[PDB]
Amino acid sequence: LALYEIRKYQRSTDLLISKIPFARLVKEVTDEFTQDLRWQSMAIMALQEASEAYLVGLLEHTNLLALHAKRITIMKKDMQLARRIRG
């Protein structure tokens, strides 16, 4: 059952990652950088969408990097050289 989840999560054009643990994470990083700040939920789902787009871009860049080095399972070095062509 390899092609089942690829045709399921891609066609369903909604989100997949969590919201309230991501709210706890953004509260953690604002405790790291700032003083508590109130956060609009539209801003939290915008950060969620931007993180999702950045992650799917990084994984679709490492997809061909896996098959380039005669591999299928991606490695830790694949998330060390895909950043070189991402800044």
Added chain:
DNA sequence: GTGCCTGGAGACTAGGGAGTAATCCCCTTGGCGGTTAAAACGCGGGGGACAGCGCGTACGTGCGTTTAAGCGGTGCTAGAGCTGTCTACGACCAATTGAGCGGCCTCGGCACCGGGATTCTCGA
């Protein structure tokens, strides 16, 4: 569907950009020779690309379990507008000055060029 508040539409008068005369004029585009360092043809090769095998392991997959965690309510709490009210607050045209450009003249280490001392050959 119904609707009232307000940006949109628009002509008249000062008032500042546009492209057409005008002319330098500097940069460029085009070609002739030379000479030379780089581009091209070829040839043996060997070191690196590539197919295949050994393997083992660790993730593909499945199952018991917990584990937050999601959907719905609602008060608690504390952060986002809006109209008054008053203060600052940055610009406009003009005399005076200024300070960095147009074109000029002075140094100074780098590469080339000649003597003092040293070494090599012959002569005395």
